[PDB]
Design a protein around this ligand. Structure first.
Ligand SMILES: Cc1ccccc1C
Length: 245
């Protein structure tokens, strides 16, 4: 036995291109269920962060904790330690995490994608975050952020979110605390940000800052999709990963 994070391994396991997926606040690797369908030609590794999905333990309270956990996995897991061309794909809080991992300068991490993410989340809705600080999760606002559950894919994937609300609360507080912006200039590898213009949660402006600050960077703005862009337009998001890796 070992203390490695739980992961799922799918796709073309012999591909020279390894994609390591890192999920976001209050969810788990299940959130990538649609996106993984369009990336089958790659060696896909989907991680559960500590305390999420099948990875046991207390959820770290800071993005720095998650960054250290993910770096430990990359360096030490049998599934990544020998892989020479890793692209990190981080969604939501995972976007900040993969930017933080890029700053660790791991020899085998070659590119990063921040999907509906950011390096700082300073404009999170004040009333929503006040509730979070009072240990209350506004499901109406969460649904608004993902664009509702009328799309059957959205209904399905919304149900994959963690059932204990303490996890979402922990993760949103971690997001309100993180600020990697003034370190983005130190990232040596290519970074691509992908986001929907109609975001209420991970605003397009957060992705514009990533593009501005990282020297070798790309930005794709979809007109619509809100925070469930990776579910309702998984095919389009996958195309915008393929054109970058
Ligand atoms: C990752 C995730 C899932 C559902 C709502 C908000 C967020 C940040």
């Amino acid at each position: 036995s070992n203390a490695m994070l739980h992961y799922v391994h799918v796709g073309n396991k012999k591909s020279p291109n390894t994609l390591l997926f890192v999920h976001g606040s209050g969810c788990n690797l299940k959130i990538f269920g649609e996106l993984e369908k369009y990336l089958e030609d790659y060696n896909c590794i989907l991680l559960d962060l500590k305390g999420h999905g099948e990875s046991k333990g207390q959820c770290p309270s800071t993005v720095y904790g998650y960054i250290d956990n993910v770096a430990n996995f990359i360096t030490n897991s049998e599934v990544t330690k020998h892989q020479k061309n890793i692209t990190l794909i981080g969604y939501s809080m995972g976007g900040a995490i993969v930017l933080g991992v890029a700053l660790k300068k791991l020899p085998n991490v070659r590119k990063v994608v921040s999907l509906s993410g950011g390096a700082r989340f300073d404009k999170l809705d004040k009333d929503f975050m006040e509730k979070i600080y009072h240990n209350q999760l506004d499901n109406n606002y969460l649904l608004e952020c993902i664009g509702g559950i009328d799309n059957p894919l959205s209904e399905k994937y919304f149900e994959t979110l963690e059932k204990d609300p303490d996890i979402m609360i922990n993760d949103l507080i971690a997001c309100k605390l993180i600020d990697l912006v003034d370190n983005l200039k130190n990232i040596d590898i290519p970074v691509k940000a992908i986001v929907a213009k109609d975001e209420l949660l991970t605003l397009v402006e957060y992705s514009e800052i990533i593009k501005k600050e990282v020297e070798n960077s790309e930005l794709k703005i979809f007109e619509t999709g809100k925070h469930f862009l990776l579910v309702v337009n998984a095919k389009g998001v996958a195309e915008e990963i393929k054109n970058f890796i």
